[PDB]
């Protein structure tokens, strides 16, 4: 008969045995505090001091961090040999870490050879594209998880709780009750964020950061994931080979030849802005609080000063937790899932959620009802970094260790 | 003098005649109970019964099926005469669905033409690209509306009832009102989700899969929209006819030989996973429950157990339904149209919605001010299939018959 | 010790000196109206007129209006000298606007030159690809901001009161508060709207309109952003010169030639439709009421007939504003910053938010906390028109002038 739950956050109240109620749209970009005295209905000499303080919004974005963007100068050469293959010689793109080369190999005619060449279907012309004057231009994160929250502190008499709250949850205790109610629409996952400079100002939002096709001139088209190392844009284009007789073959190159920079920066009013105050930047993660003022969200605070508020997520269920394995990837869309062994003990049965978290962040979360005894609890998850240990946990309460998930693009 | 108007659901409340209130942020994977004997005030002996039970989040999703993804190989081929026409010759390819010829007609040349081969100005050379190698990897369907809803089940005394109540509507009865208000940015119109396997596990979305143009490499690249006929990708590149004295023409293609299954499985982990349970996959439609513990909504329950609520859609007018026309497409994000007959008794005029709908489910609706009589009214939707029926409806009465769409993509 | 703040829109209430509350779910697209005489508990013979109109869901999005998107022709053709640069000849399309030339100079050969010409490496054959049939299909607008309201009237008693509400925003007053709550995802910034006719009916939600490289096919590949001049798009395929003995030279292109209107077209019912009622176009703006009938919002009315709410945001606190400098763009989705001269006195500091607005539109807020004399506040916002001269305003406030932002796209 019994079936215990704690995914509600709230309370049951009757609304004649409750004394205070606040309800308004607060600027997301603001604090907010409340003090009062709650005294006895001209019935006592007992007061109760309340003290809420409600801080800024804060949003926390579970990232990939993509490395530098790089701007530089598409250049074309060629290079000519009236005998030997091509593997036989050395090019002078060949340190050039992005380049094209197209070979015209065992083709030597009469009227697209040098003076000195009486060479036919010998030798070799190469037509070869390089990046050159590369300079890294910003930082790109790609957008896994966003989550909004505020923090907040209630004082009731000598109670005093703080708690993180996220957008669309409660903060619950015996005599009061807030609640978050919002939505935002700036940012989406699979966005790309690009920060130009020591941007703890503000930054651009692209939606269409190449990804599986790059093609020179794409946003994000020339990449350098970590120090060393691009991630060279594709040429699309064709090469002619410009004959003439007695005279060197001449390259050409009839694709786009502006950098993704370039042909960004050309139409940057296109794309959107956003800013930011306070940021923290930590592997695989940035918070920050957004000042745009004209957003808003909606606080809910119920006060009761004498009888408790009904908690509707009070149980007598006990909980133990640990890791069994993982599987998956950080830094990664797609995730990782977390594999938890978890004992209910003091009820028959108990709904509630188990999360995949690591220092008072939380990646995962899966909803279960656990029956007495153990469980085998799957918990998918996204975020975390290469150090992240993925931890088993219920409510405030965590497994002693947690698992490395795998990484991602490899 | 009267205006009456039922698009508002719920209820006026006297907030000190008013006897419980239940507000708490619950997991949307998650469903909750509530039970109490509701009694009056220690003054007297007659208690009420009150069972309320909130079942998991539904997504329902009404797409279009897209058919298969495919990978396949990219292969490129030559065939030469010496003379003729280029369609006076069958090349391998044409059995092929999916190819790219290149016709070099009436061009044959001394250091091009084979030994056997005097041809100047004659002919035809041919290379040709085509698909093969081919396997279904997925079945992908476009996202045309998203609606979230938990099913809401209320027992007061001998009252009894049951609802699906959409995300930011309200459950509303002579003492009990239940509101949910959520928002959730997983997904968006437009998105196409990708199903690799039975995958009454998970999927991807895609924000970008090809629509108007679709080239090899990119995502959706190769479809087939039913059992047999594909929708062929574009190939950008050229071809380079390369020559030779006395040998045989040999084609060349410089564009992208890498498809879009394999391009996108390169960097797989730039790309958002979703799971699912208990899915329910219909013509044109996905239901199911998303099991992410990490997302939230809001509920309220307001009980007055003595005097009823003022239900604020409450009204005497009366309506009668009949469909008159239709315009438009099934499975289209553009939608259709329908024309419903709707006469008004009772009342000199009503505000209310119409709908268009099938099978309890509804795909579109119209507010409208009717006058007493007749009333042409049009209501524009989205989303169906080809056995869809779309009927006049009026809250929960609808017409005798519903009309047909037309097919979308003719 | 004092900390005023004005960025909570709400009250504090006291749950048994409340008389009523009305709680609903509304159709966005309808209006709703509440009348009734508030009477003392059968306790006297004084009743007050409550009388409360809340108008149908507008949305306002600013926007930068790109002119029209056309569809065309793309058409080849070839022009041939023995002799001569390329520069010395003047070619048919060089009066079209949109064209991409070939010059195969200095290249005359034996079986690729005509009868009359005995050329060798001199003249030029001219391959030349020019837009022609060109017609307007389209107005478009790139979507910046998206802000959705309800203007909402409240007579109590003998007060009267109208004001527009943003959604997740509340109406105040000493004795009615109505809280607004609510998402929408059908829109979002950096969207493109397509308008095909004189659509005071409905228009497209274009994704990926194209902005940093628009090739010929794409969606928004033709632009004219005014009434002369084409945003011409790229072509990235390759020409080939055909050549024959005795014969004049004659041009192929194997790139994309089909207009991106036609491809558009040719799959329409991938693409999302909305609509439109009682439009209002103004320079870098539109305003509608979306009739779709299947949107809803949450609406909570709360009437104290006695004691005064506690306004959550009353303060003594007086501001003094004048505008000091602007810098950014209008038409822009980076933006502008306006920087603003604010005068506190009364209170020592005062925790608000200082807005850029012109003609009661509000474009960017800062929320900030002021200290007793002067301040400097800068406020970043997005969108305006050429036209537009935005103020430093606070609350319903402003400067006795405004500043007018650059143009983007410069
Ligand atoms: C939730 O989904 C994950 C993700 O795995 C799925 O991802 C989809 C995008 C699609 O590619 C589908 O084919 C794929 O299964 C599930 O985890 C995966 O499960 C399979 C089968 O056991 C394993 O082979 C994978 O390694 C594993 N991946 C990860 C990252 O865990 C998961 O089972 C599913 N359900 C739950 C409760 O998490
Ligand atoms: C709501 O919009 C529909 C959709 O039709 C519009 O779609 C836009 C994307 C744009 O292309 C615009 O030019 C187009 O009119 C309207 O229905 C259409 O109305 C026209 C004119 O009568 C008919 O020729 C179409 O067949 C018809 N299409 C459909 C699917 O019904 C509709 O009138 C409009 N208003 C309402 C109340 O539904
Ligand atoms: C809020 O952001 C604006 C925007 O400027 C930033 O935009 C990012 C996309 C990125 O390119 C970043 O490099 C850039 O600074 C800030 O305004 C800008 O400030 C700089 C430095 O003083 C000026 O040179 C710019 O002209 C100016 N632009 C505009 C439109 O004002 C702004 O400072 C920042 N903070 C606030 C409080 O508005
Ligand atoms: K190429
Ligand atoms: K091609
Ligand atoms: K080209
Ligand atoms: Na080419």
């Given at each position: 008969?019994?079936?215990?739950?704690?995914?509600?956050?709230?309370?049951?109240?009757?609304?004649?045995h409750?004394?205070?109620?606040?309800?308004?749209?607060?600027?997301?970009?603001?604090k907010?505090?409340?003090?009062?005295?709650?005294?006895?209905?001209?019935?006592?000499?007992?007061?109760?001091?309340?003290?809420?303080?409600?801080?800024?919004?804060?949003?926390?974005?579970?990232?990939?961090?993509?490395?530098?963007?790089?701007?530089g100068?598409l250049?074309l050469?060629?290079?000519?040999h009236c005998?030997?293959?091509?593997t036989?010689y050395?090019?002078?793109?060949?340190?050039?870490?992005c380049?094209?080369?197209?070979?015209?190999?065992?083709?030597?005619?009469?009227?697209?050879?040098?003076?000195?060449?009486?060479?036919?279907?010998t030798?070799?012309?190469?037509?070869?594209?390089?990046?050159?004057?590369?300079?890294?231009?910003?930082?790109?994160?790609?957008?896994?998880?966003?989550?909004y929250?505020?923090?907040?502190?209630?004082?009731?008499?000598?109670?005093?709780?703080?708690?993180?709250?996220?957008?669309?949850d409660?903060?619950?205790?015996?005599?009061?009750?807030?609640?978050?109610?919002?939505?935002?629409?700036?940012?989406?996952?699979?966005?790309?964020?690009?920060?130009?400079?020591?941007?703890?100002?503000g930054?651009?939002?692209?939606?269409?950061?190449?990804?599986?096709?790059c093609?020179?001139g794409?946003?994000?088209?020339?990449?350098?994931?970590?120090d060393?190392?691009?991630?060279?844009?594709?040429?699309?284009?064709?090469?002619?080979?410009?004959?003439?007789?007695?005279?060197?073959?001449?390259?050409?190159?009839?694709?786009?030849?502006?950098?993704?920079?370039?042909?960004v920066?050309?139409?940057?009013?296109?794309?959107?802005?956003?800013?930011?105050?306070?940021?923290?930047?930590?592997?695989?993660?940035?918070?920050?609080?957004?000042?745009?003022?004209?957003?808003?969200?909606?606080?809910?605070?119920?006060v009761?000063?004498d009888?408790?508020?009904?908690?509707?997520?009070?149980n007598?269920?006990?909980?133990?937790?640990?890791?069994?394995?993982?599987?998956?990837?950080?830094?990664?869309?797609?995730?990782?899932?977390?594999?938890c062994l978890?004992?209910l003990?003091?009820?028959?049965?108990?709904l509630?959620?188990?999360?995949?978290?690591?220092?008072?962040?939380?990646?995962?979360?899966?909803?279960?009802?656990?029956?007495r005894?153990?469980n085998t609890?799957?918990?998918?998850?996204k975020?975390?970094?290469?150090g992240?240990?993925?931890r088993?946990?219920?409510?405030?309460?965590?497994?002693?260790?947690?698992?490395?998930?795998?990484?991602?693009?490899?």
């Amino acid at each position: 008969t019994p079936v215990w739950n704690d995914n509600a956050h709230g309370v049951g109240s009757v609304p004649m045995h409750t004394d205070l109620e606040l309800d308004f749209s607060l600027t997301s970009s603001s604090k907010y505090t409340y003090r009062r005295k709650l005294t006895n209905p001209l019935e006592e000499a007992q007061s109760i001091d309340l003290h809420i303080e409600i801080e800024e919004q804060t949003i926390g974005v579970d990232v990939h961090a993509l490395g530098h963007w790089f701007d530089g100068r598409l250049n074309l050469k060629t290079s000519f040999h009236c005998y030997g293959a091509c593997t036989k010689y050395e090019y002078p793109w060949h340190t050039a870490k992005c380049h094209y080369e197209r070979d015209y190999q065992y083709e030597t005619s009469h009227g697209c050879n040098p003076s000195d060449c009486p060479g036919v279907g010998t030798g070799c012309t190469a037509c070869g594209l390089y990046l050159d004057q590369l300079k890294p231009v910003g930082s790109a994160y790609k957008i896994i998880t966003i989550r909004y929250s505020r923090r907040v502190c209630v004082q009731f008499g000598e109670e005093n709780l703080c708690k993180i709250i996220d957008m669309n949850d409660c903060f619950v205790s015996r005599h009061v009750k807030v609640c978050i109610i919002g939505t935002v629409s700036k940012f989406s996952q699979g966005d790309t964020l690009l920060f130009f400079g020591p941007l703890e100002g503000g930054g651009l939002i692209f939606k269409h950061w190449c990804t599986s096709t790059c093609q020179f001139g794409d946003p994000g088209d020339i990449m350098s994931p970590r120090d060393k190392g691009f991630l060279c844009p594709e040429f699309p284009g064709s090469f002619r080979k410009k004959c003439n007789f007695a005279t060197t073959p001449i390259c050409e190159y009839d694709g786009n030849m502006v950098s993704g920079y370039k042909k960004v920066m050309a139409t940057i009013d296109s794309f959107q802005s956003f800013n930011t105050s306070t940021m923290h930047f930590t592997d695989e993660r940035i918070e920050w609080k957004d000042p745009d003022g004209m957003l808003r969200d909606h606080i809910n605070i119920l006060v009761t000063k004498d009888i408790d508020f009904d908690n509707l997520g009070e149980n007598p269920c006990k909980i133990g937790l640990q890791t069994s394995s993982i599987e998956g990837a950080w830094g990664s869309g797609v995730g990782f899932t977390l594999t938890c062994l978890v004992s209910l003990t003091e009820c028959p049965t108990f709904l509630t959620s188990i999360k995949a978290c690591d220092k008072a962040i939380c990646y995962g979360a899966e909803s279960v009802t656990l029956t007495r005894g153990q469980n085998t609890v799957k918990v998918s998850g996204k975020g975390g970094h290469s150090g992240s240990t993925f931890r088993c946990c219920h409510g405030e309460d965590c497994s002693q260790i947690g698992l490395h998930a795998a990484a991602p693009h490899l």
